[PDB]
Design a protein around this ligand. Structure first.
Ligand code: HEM
Ligand SMILES: COc1ccc(C(=O)O)cc1
Ligand SMILES: [Cl-]
Length: 399
């Protein structure tokens, strides 16, 4: 390896705590430096503009996922857990396991489940207003709401559910480099991993839920009985804390930007796009990696075989080369093509679940709430892959 000959090198640590606290100046530096940069801190290439993020995402055989989508290269180091059969696979293996999850989380499934999700969101906003409206948008809403619907939709038992958010925090930290956040999460992981490992098994998943639906594909031969609990493991990894942070992004956006909330109230049919624009704007899933499978030319750079490439999805989603006024939260923006859910063959399989949760929460706010205001100090949460808040006191004014 030439280790980044011919491209600009930068010392920016995109996994440093001061960076997660305020990433936007360094994301701009990463974009301005060039289309391809080399990050000295971790000896990986980086792409922070929309054009190259999009190109890498849409070339999955060249920029592969089967050597891990975190920093660690699975060819060189044993993975911290056995690889995801969907996220950390390439076609054709990826095609067959993705197709199972695309059927489980299908658009018709979302329509059959819609009233359950919407009634829970209505009831939650009612509860928050009956409390007086002075509530923590994180604990009381962004966290509480997905906890009230997703474990039941999975068919998980009641007991042990406190393990779910720590498990997700661990998975998202573990894509990161071997820093304190990662080391510490892995050290405390055993009980969370054990809980998950157990709940993925068929006898532990209630009939009618997503878990049992996956396991049914083993009965028809479409997957094996040892694949089935791993595909359940994917949904327990990615299905809860992503939506918590996307809901948090949406509430935080609407709270800061009252004119946009008033627009949402005027036309509640903007709920879906308001949620999608929050996903662009905050990019709750900030980064993933790929690994080159061959020597490649990317935007003028040479990249050797077997190099990690860090994609900055959150910077791509704010890149002024692609987005008009990228730092504005605009709930009528044409958001199509943002990379907050990825792009191409691995584009979020659960996006219909995430959008259903976000829509129903925003629709309940649009109908029941006259105004939203930040009410007290916020506290940001640091995670190697996720962006979002630990606390956000708000005031909801009832309609
Ligand atoms: C706002 C919430 C969400 C965000 C921002 C998000 C983000 C992402 C991103 C960026 C990817 C691309 C991964 C890559 O390209 O390597 C992805 C894929 C994936 N997501 Fe989501 N996600 C969300 C919600 C969910 C939910 C609710 C589920 C499950 C119910 C889920 C399950 C998955 C799985 C299994 C994949 C792997 C798909 C594949 O590799 O083909 N996600 N997501
Ligand atoms: C979007 O984040 C993830 C995280 C884990 C997995 C998985 O475990 O398959 C998928 C997506
Ligand atoms: Cl695990």
């Amino acid at each position: 390896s030439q280790h980044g000959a011919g491209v600009p090198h930068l010392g920016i640590d995109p996994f440093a705590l001061d960076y997660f606290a305020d990433p936007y100046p360094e994301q701009e530096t990463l974009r301005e430096a060039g289309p391809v940069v080399y990050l000295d801190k971790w000896n990986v290439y980086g792409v922070a503009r929309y054009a190259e993020v999009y190109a890498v995402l849409n070339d999955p055989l060249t920029f592969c996922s089967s050597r891990g989508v975190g920093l660690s290269d699975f060819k060189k180091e044993k993975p911290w857990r056995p690889p995801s059969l969907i996220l950390e696979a390439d076609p054709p293996a990826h095609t067959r396991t993705r197709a199972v999850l695309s059927k489980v989380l299908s658009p018709a499934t979302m329509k059959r489940l819609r009233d359950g999700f919407a009634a829970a969101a209505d009831a939650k906003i009612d509860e928050l207003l009956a409390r007086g409206g002075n509530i923590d948008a994180i604990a009381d809403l962004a966290e509480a709401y997905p906890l009230s619907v997703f474990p039941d939709a999975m068919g998980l038992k009641q007991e042990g559910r406190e393990n779910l958010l720590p498990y997700a925090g661990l998975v998202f930290n573990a894509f990161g480099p071997p820093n304190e956040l990662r080391q510490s999460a892995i050290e405390r992981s055993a009980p969370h991993q054990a809980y998950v490992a157990e709940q993925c098994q068929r006898p532990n998943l209630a009939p009618g839920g997503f878990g049992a639906c996956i396991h049914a594909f083993s009965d028809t031969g479409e997957i094996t009985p040892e694949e089935a609990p791993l595909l359940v493991r994917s949904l327990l990894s990615a299905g809860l804390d992503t939506t918590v942070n996307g809901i948090a992004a949406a509430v935080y956006c609407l709270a800061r930007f009252p004119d946009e909330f008033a627009r949402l109230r005027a036309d509640p049919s903007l709920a879906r796009n308001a949620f999608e624009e929050a996903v662009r704007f905050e990019s709750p899933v900030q980064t993933f990696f790929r690994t080159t499978t061959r020597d490649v030319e990317l935007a003028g750079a040479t990249i050797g075989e077997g190099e990690k490439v860090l994609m900055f999805l959150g910077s791509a989603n704010r890149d002024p080369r692609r987005w008009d006024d990228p730092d504005r939260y605009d709930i009528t923006r044409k958001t199509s093509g943002h990379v907050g859910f990825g792009s191409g063959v691995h584009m979020c399989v659960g996006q219909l679940v995430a959008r259903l949760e976000g829509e129903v929460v925003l629709a309940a706010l649009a109908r029941k709430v006259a105004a939203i205001e930040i009410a007290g100090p916020l506290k940001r949460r640091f995670n190697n892959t996720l962006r979002g808040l630990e606390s956000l006191p708000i005031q909801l004014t009832p309609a």
